[PDB]
Amino acid sequence: QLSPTELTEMRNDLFNKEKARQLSLTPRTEKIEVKHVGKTDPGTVFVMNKNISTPYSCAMHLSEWYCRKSILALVDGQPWDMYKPLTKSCEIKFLTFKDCDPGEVNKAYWRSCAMMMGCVIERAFKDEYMVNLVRAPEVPVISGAFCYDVVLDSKLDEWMPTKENLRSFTKDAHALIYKDLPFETLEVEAKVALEIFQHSKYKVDFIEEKASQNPERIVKLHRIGDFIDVSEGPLIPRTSICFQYEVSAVHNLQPTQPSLIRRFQGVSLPVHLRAHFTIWDKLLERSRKMVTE
Amino acid sequence: KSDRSIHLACTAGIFDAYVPPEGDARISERMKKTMASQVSIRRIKDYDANFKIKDFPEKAKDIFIEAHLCLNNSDHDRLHTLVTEHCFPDMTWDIKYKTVRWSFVESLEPSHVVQVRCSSMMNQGNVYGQITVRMHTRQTLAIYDRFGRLMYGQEDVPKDVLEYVVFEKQLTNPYGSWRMHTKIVPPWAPPKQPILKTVMIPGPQLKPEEEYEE
Amino acid sequence: ISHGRVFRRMGLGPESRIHLLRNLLTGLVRHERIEAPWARVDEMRGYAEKLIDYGKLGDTNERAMRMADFWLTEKDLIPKLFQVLAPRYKDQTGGYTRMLQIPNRSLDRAKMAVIEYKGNCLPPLPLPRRDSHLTLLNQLLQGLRQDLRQSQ
Amino acid sequence: ISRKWEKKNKIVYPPQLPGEPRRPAEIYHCRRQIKYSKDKMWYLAKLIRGMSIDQALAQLEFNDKKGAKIIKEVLLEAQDMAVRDHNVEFRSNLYIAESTSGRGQCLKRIRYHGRGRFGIMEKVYCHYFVKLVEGPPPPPEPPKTAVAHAKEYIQQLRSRTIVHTL
Amino acid sequence: AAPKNRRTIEVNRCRRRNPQKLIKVKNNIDVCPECGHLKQKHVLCAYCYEKVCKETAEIRRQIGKQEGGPFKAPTIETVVLYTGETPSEQDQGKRIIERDRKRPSWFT
Ligand SMILES: [Mg+2]
Ligand SMILES: [Mg+2]
Ligand SMILES: [Zn+2]
């Protein structure tokens, strides 16, 4: 058994080694051409560096308004992270929170907020007890909350968190928001992913599911500081794109045997779409109600 | 209507350009081509009977190396003596506020005199002779910024180069010399080394009444 | 003290204020969209909607005819208030004009306004549109609305 | 006159060693003999001081002064020569380091007063100077905390020496 | 009443650089979604407004060409038809104003 600190630096070391391996895979500067086909600033060519430059780099070439209001990228029709390096000549279209159809931005925001909740859960409980994370399900943003399923210790099978503990979770999440960490992204081989999450069986199963879904068995790993998690899609650029955040409730799921999978639920809203206190309180209660997938 | 006119010491163009041959770099009518050349070479030796075209290529390489080394120290006086007035602005204007670090490692193959042509007499009483020389050397280049930051190239790494440098001497002038006039870059030339920064090409800035028609 | 003073001290006096607003109204009836200083446009907006109400009273009403004769200086617009504009708004009860703020005038930096009679034939103004129903906040509130409709 | 601000955009620095910080880009621009008062240009230039280039251009685009329009033109020109001639990569990675105004060469013109009297009027001209530096706008100096005020007080209660003795 | 003493540059800097005299920073600036130019969130976009105004001015120029003279407003309604558009059955008895361009995408 590695101590949780040693597991953290191990996973960080493997992540850094793989990222440096891709940066070594492309050593000589190569120039790609990205065509801006968004409505505003129409037909604008960016001449970018291959596997180095980002949709954020194109946004910095345009203006600070693009940098601060661009949450996702549409690279050749597919949703791209803003801090994910660009691999080919393509067409780009920056996606904001207040478009006509913000659905992919909503999904990316809900996945990012779930990831942060998972980091808080992993580093909240005391050293004696055992914390494992299964998955963050894809729950519609019309349901009321983002969710993470955590298997806790058998010493704490009878335990339910108090409101003080839930607010402590919320304070840790706000500490992450204040820390303002980029959401780093890595496309990786299933072998390297399995290596990173070797000591975690639920992560093995989920990695195998995503690797089965894609032909070359490349999965998506995101890192926020020292936490690394497997994802089911792109994420928002920074933890500071959260303004209102709350870990609302913890619900114990039906089949208690063989083990207790506990659903931690939360609700969040960005800086660009922040709500008043009355409306946010009502959203808090509706997130405290249980979400079913 | 003054009797004083500008005493130009060069021309503004290339006399009967050497269309570089396709395959000259990929592979490691001739009588007329080398006929025009011999006729002209004799014209040059009419104007100075101590010229050897077997002696030019080493002189051309020396002029090349010393001119481009002036670009390193900014010795514009020596440059005006080893390069023409047509070649001075398009060698200095883009480096004015930049630091150019150039070097000559070696020569892959010896230089060849590959074309010699001469102008007519009716250029103001002045007759010019223009000689094309092929070069295939190995050079280094590192162009720095106003603030000392790298823009282009690598400091130590030598890279191969093929250039068709056209030298010119004004033959009627009593103190004329062989100086670098232009150089031909082939239309089939390999693409140059990529730059070290990202570039945004702006789209059409449209007036409000205009509509973006792709 | 100017408590409960609903009108503006405009122009060279009260008649001058009425004549400035009359010329603004004549321009609005002729062109169906004009731009002017913002305060003048507000003060005129009220009169623009009462003019449509008199037009809806109609051309055989002698009071309505007299009032249109006063407020329309060009006299070709009186047939137009009664046989074009008043009919366009026979279905609406009272919301006939739209007033919006347009930048600032580039001579004296005055607050400016555009006013249009709804309907129109002109290109549409770039109206302020609320946020879409598909944004994050609106989707969360619709989830709240559906759950309330279920629970009650 | 003196025109030293335009020779500042011509300092060539020695090439940098490969282990040193990158050295941000500096761009000096200025407009001379503006028909405006320096005392009103001061408020416009103190408003755009320390801002990002885009934030500055927003504030100047919606400010109501003739000087705001002139300073917008000067800022846009400076951004263009930044990424045209000084090798700035992103045109949004700039901030206003310095923004001031100077007196220009003015003209004196008589202003007929009553009686038999005259006043001399000044046709005022000004200069506007701007230095752009590559980078994000630097973080503002945070306000002093009670802990920082107390630590300063205790340093002074501990720096006290016995005066005028051995 | 005249100044009894000259006012110093220190007193004058306090008066002229007091925060009340400084320009306040604005926070109502937002990007227009349709053109990307900067707008104030309570005022119509300038670029879009002058686009609309220039098309309206062309339509008003053609209206006067048809009306032909002063005091000749119509008693019927009006409709703007572009190149390649026939009058609709609803746009029957309406003065048709023809314009020699494609219908702008923002005009319906
Ligand atoms: Mg008045
Ligand atoms: Mg007199
Ligand atoms: Zn707009």
| Tokens standing for residue B42 | 């004799």
Alpha-carbon span D34 to D67, nearest angstrom: 9
D85 touches chain E (CB under 8 A): no
Work out the end-to-end distance of chain A between its first and last CA atoms, rounded to an integer number of angstroms.
34
| Tokens standing for residue A88 | 């080919």
Find tokens 């400084």 and name the residue. E22
User: Which residue segment(s) compose the domain that C27 sits in?
Assistant: 10-120
D44 touches chain E (CB under 8 A): yes
- Give, for E21, the enclosing helix (H) or strand (E): none
Our count of domains for chain B comes to: 1
- Give, for E14, the enclosing helix (H) or strand (E): helix E9-16
Angle at C107 between CA C102 and CA C108, to 5 degrees: 80
For β-strands C33-37 and B199-201, DSSP reports them as: unpaired
Alpha-carbon span D1 to B119, nearest angstrom: 52
Q: Give how far Cα A27 sits from Cα of A23, A187, B74, Å.
A: 7, 18, 33
C30 touches chain E (CB under 8 A): yes
Work out the end-to-end distance of chain B between its first and last CA atoms, rounded to an integer number of angstroms.
54
Q: How many CB atoms lie within 10 A of CB A149?
A: 19
| Residue E45 annotated in ligand binding | yes
| Torsion sign, CA atoms A224, D135, D70, D35 | positive
3-state secondary structure C4-51: CCCCCCCCCCHHHHHHHHHHHHHHHHHHCEEEEEHHHHHHHHHHHHHH
Q: How does DSSP classify residue D9? A: G
3-state secondary structure chain A: CCCHHHHHHHHHHHHHHHHHHHHHHCCCCCEEEEEECCCCCCCEEEEEECCCCCHHHHHHHHCHHHHHHCCEEEECCEEECCCCCCCCCEEECEECCCCCCCHHHHHHHHHHHHHHHHHHHHCCCCCCCCCEEEECCCCCCCCCCEEEEEECCHHHCCCCCCHHHHHHHHHHHHHHHHHCCECEEEEEEHHHHHHHCCCCHHHHHHHHHHHHHCCCCEEEEEEECCEEEEECCCCCCEHHHCCEEEEEEEEECCCCCCCCEEEEEEEEECHHHCCCHHHHHHHHHHHHCCCCC
Does the distance separating the beta carbons of B208 and E104 come in below 8 Å?
A: no
**Angle formed by the axes of helices A103-122 and A163-179, nearest 10°:** 110
Alpha-carbon span D82 to D94, nearest angstrom: 9
| Tokens standing for residue A143 | 């349901």
3-state class (DSSP) for residue D58 = helix
Which one-letter amino acid corresponds to residue D88?
V
Which one-letter amino acid corresponds to residue B178?
W
Angle at E73 between CA C85 and CA C45, to 5 degrees: 45
Who contacts A158 (Cβ-Cβ below 8 Å, separation ≥6)?
A: none
| Tokens standing for residue B76 | 């514009």
Decide if C14 is inside a domain.
Answer: yes
Q: How does DSSP classify residue D37? A: -
Chain A to chain B Cβ contacts (< 8 Å): 39
Does the distance separating the beta carbons of B194 and A41 come in below 8 Å?
A: no
Q: How many CB atoms lie within 10 A of CB C50?
A: 14
Work out the end-to-end distance of chain D between its first and last CA atoms, rounded to an integer number of angstroms.
59
- Burial class from Cβ neighbours inside 10 Å (0-12, 13-18, 19+) for residue A288 reads middle
Our count of domains for chain D comes to: 1
Which one-letter amino acid corresponds to residue A106?
N
Ligand positioned closest to the Cα atom of C16: 1
Ligand positioned closest to the Cα atom of E51: 3
Find tokens 């004058």 and name the residue. E12
Under 8 Å between Cβ of D76 and D61: no
What's the alpha-carbon Rg for chain A, to the nearest Å?
A: 20
Nearest Cα neighbor of C65 from C47, C52, C78 is C78
Which one-letter amino acid corresponds to residue A176?
L
B208 touches chain E (CB under 8 A): yes
Who contacts D121 (Cβ-Cβ below 8 Å, separation ≥6)?
A: D108, D109, D110, D111
For β-strands E38-40 and E29-31, DSSP reports them as: antiparallel
| Torsion sign, CA atoms C128, C132, C133, C135 | negative
- Burial class from Cβ neighbours inside 10 Å (0-12, 13-18, 19+) for residue B115 reads buried
Under 8 Å between Cβ of C136 and A106: yes
Who contacts C85 (Cβ-Cβ below 8 Å, separation ≥6)?
A: C29, C52, C55, C117, C119
3-state secondary structure D69-137: HHHHHHHHHHHHHHHHHCCCCCCCCEEEEEEEEEECCCEEEEEECCCCCEEEEEECCEEEEEEEEECCC
Who contacts C30 (Cβ-Cβ below 8 Å, separation ≥6)?
A: C74, C77, E73
| Torsion sign, CA atoms E39, E41, E42, E44 | positive
Find tokens 């001469």 and name the residue. B118
Strands of the A227-231 sheet, one edge to the other: A184-189, A218-224, A227-231
CATH (domain of D56)? 3.90.470.10
CA C118 to chain centre: 8
Phi-psi category of C11—alpha, beta or left, where left has phi over 0 and alpha has psi -120 to 50?
left
Phi-psi category of C149—alpha, beta or left, where left has phi over 0 and alpha has psi -120 to 50?
alpha
Under 8 Å between Cβ of C20 and C26: no
Nearest Cα neighbor of A267 from A289, A250, A244, A251 is A244
Who contacts E91 (Cβ-Cβ below 8 Å, separation ≥6)?
A: E79, E81
| Torsion sign, CA atoms B92, B95, B97, B101 | negative
Long-range contacts from A250-255, C-beta under 8 angstroms, 24+ separation: A250/A160, A250/A161, A250/A166, A251/A290, A252/A160, A253/A149
| Tokens standing for residue C121 | 């034939």
Alpha-carbon span C139 to E88, nearest angstrom: 39
Our count of domains for chain C comes to: 1
* DSSP code string of C49-80: HHHHHHHHH-TT-HHHHHHHHHH-SSSSHHHH
CA C79 to chain centre: 20
What's the alpha-carbon Rg for chain E, to the nearest Å?
A: 27
Q: Which residues pair with A223 in a beta bridge?
A: A184, A228
- Burial class from Cβ neighbours inside 10 Å (0-12, 13-18, 19+) for residue A7 reads middle
Q: Give how far Cα C141 sits from Cα of A71, A105, B85, C145, Å.
A: 22, 17, 75, 6
Q: How many CB atoms lie within 10 A of CB A276?
A: 7
Q: Give how far Cα A246 sits from Cα of A113, A143, A169, A219, Å.
A: 10, 15, 8, 29
For β-strands D94-103 and D126-134, DSSP reports them as: antiparallel
A36 touches chain B (CB under 8 A): yes
3-state secondary structure chain B: CCCCCCCCCCCCCCCCCCCCCCCCCCCCCHHHHHHHHHHHHHHHHHHCCCCCCCCHHHHHHHHHHHHHHHHHHCCHHHHHHHECCCCCHHHHCCCCCCEEEEEEEEEEEEEEEEEEEECCCCECCECEEEEEEEEEEEEEEEEECCCCCEEEEEEEEEEEEEEEEEEEEECCCCCCCCEEEEEECCCCCCCCCCCCCCEEECCCCCCCCCCCCC
Who contacts B172 (Cβ-Cβ below 8 Å, separation ≥6)?
A: B47, B125, B126, B127
Instruction: Quote the strand ranges of E25-100, DSSP E.
Output: 29-31, 38-40, 77-81, 94-98
Does the distance separating the beta carbons of C140 and A106 come in below 8 Å?
A: no
Under 8 Å between Cβ of A204 and A136: no
Under 8 Å between Cβ of E60 and C31: yes
CA B175 to chain centre: 22
B209 touches chain E (CB under 8 A): yes
Under 8 Å between Cβ of B82 and B75: no
| Tokens standing for residue D105 | 């060469």
3-state class (DSSP) for residue D60 = helix
Q: What phi, psi does B158 have (nearest 5°)? A: -85, 140
- Give, for D33, the enclosing helix (H) or strand (E): strand D26-34
| Torsion sign, CA atoms C22, C26, C32, C35 | negative
Residues of chain D neighbouring B98 (CB-CB closer than 8 A): 12
What's the alpha-carbon Rg for chain B, to the nearest Å?
A: 21
- Rounded to 10 degrees, the C-alpha dihedral B27/B33/B34/B39 comes to -160
CATH (domain of C100)? 3.90.1030.10
User: Which residue segment(s) compose the domain that D46 sits in?
Assistant: 1-166
Under 8 Å between Cβ of E78 and C123: no
| Tokens standing for residue E39 | 């707008």
Q: Give how far Cα A86 sits from Cα of A56, A74, B31, Å.
A: 10, 12, 55
Alpha-carbon span C35 to C84, nearest angstrom: 22
- Give, for C3, the enclosing helix (H) or strand (E): none
Residue of D nearest to A58 (CA): D90
- Least Cα separation, residue A47 to chain D (angstroms): 11
Decide if B62 is inside a domain.
Answer: yes
Angle at B118 between CA B114 and CA B119, to 5 degrees: 145
Report CA(D116)–ligand 2 centroid distance (Å): 6
Q: What phi, psi does D75 have (nearest 5°)? A: -65, -40
| Tokens standing for residue A249 | 């409730």
CA D110 to chain centre: 34
| Tokens standing for residue E75 | 């008693």
| Torsion sign, CA atoms B87, B88, B89, B95 | positive
Q: How does DSSP classify residue E93? A: S
Q: Which residues pair with A230 in a beta bridge?
A: A221
Q: What length does chain E have?
A: 108
Under 8 Å between Cβ of C10 and C58: no
Long-range contacts from B60-63, C-beta under 8 angstroms, 24+ separation: B60/B111, B60/B131, B60/B133, B60/B135, B60/B165, B60/B167, B60/B178, B61/B107, B61/B111, B61/B135, B63/B167, B63/B178, B63/B179, B63/B180
Q: Which residues pair with A35 in a beta bridge?
A: A45, A91
Under 8 Å between Cβ of D62 and E38: yes
Alpha-carbon span B4 to A293, nearest angstrom: 94
Which residue in the set A57, A61, A64 is minimally distant from D54, CB to CB?
A64
Structural determination approach: cryo-EM
Does the distance separating the beta carbons of A41 and E34 come in below 8 Å?
A: no
Who contacts A269 (Cβ-Cβ below 8 Å, separation ≥6)?
A: A242, A243, A244, A275, A280, A283, C136, C137, C140
| Tokens standing for residue A240 | 């500071």
Under 8 Å between Cβ of A90 and A34: yes
Does the distance separating the beta carbons of A53 and B198 come in below 8 Å?
A: yes
Long-range contacts from C146-151, C-beta under 8 angstroms, 24+ separation: C146/A142, C147/A144, C147/A286, C147/A289
Q: How does DSSP classify residue D52? A: B
Work out the end-to-end distance of chain C between its first and last CA atoms, rounded to an integer number of angstroms.
52
Who contacts E72 (Cβ-Cβ below 8 Å, separation ≥6)?
A: C76
E87 touches chain A (CB under 8 A): no
CA E74 to chain centre: 26
Q: How does DSSP classify residue E51? A: H
Q: Which residues pair with B130 in a beta bridge?
A: B117, B168
Ligand positioned closest to the Cα atom of E35: 3
Phi-psi category of B92—alpha, beta or left, where left has phi over 0 and alpha has psi -120 to 50?
alpha
- Rounded to 10 degrees, the C-alpha dihedral A16/A21/A22/A27 comes to 120
Decide if C151 is inside a domain.
Answer: no
Decide if C60 is inside a domain.
Answer: yes
CA B91 to chain centre: 9
| Residue E35 annotated in ligand binding | yes
Q: How does DSSP classify residue E43? A: S
Under 8 Å between Cβ of A133 and A203: yes
| Tokens standing for residue E22 | 């400084």
Under 8 Å between Cβ of B3 and B79: no
3-state class (DSSP) for residue E96 = strand
What's the alpha-carbon Rg for chain D, to the nearest Å?
A: 23
CATH (domain of B12)? 3.10.450.240
User: Which residue segment(s) compose the domain that B6 sits in?
Assistant: 1-184
Q: What phi, psi does B180 have (nearest 5°)? A: -80, 120
| Tokens standing for residue C123 | 């290109």
Find tokens 């011999």 and name the residue. B38
| Torsion sign, CA atoms A75, A79, A85, A88 | negative
Which one-letter amino acid corresponds to residue A142?
I
- Residue A200 CB-half CA count within 13 A: 25
Does the distance separating the beta carbons of A69 and E36 come in below 8 Å?
A: no
Q: How many CB atoms lie within 10 A of CB A99?
A: 18
Report CA(A269)–ligand 1 centroid distance (Å): 49
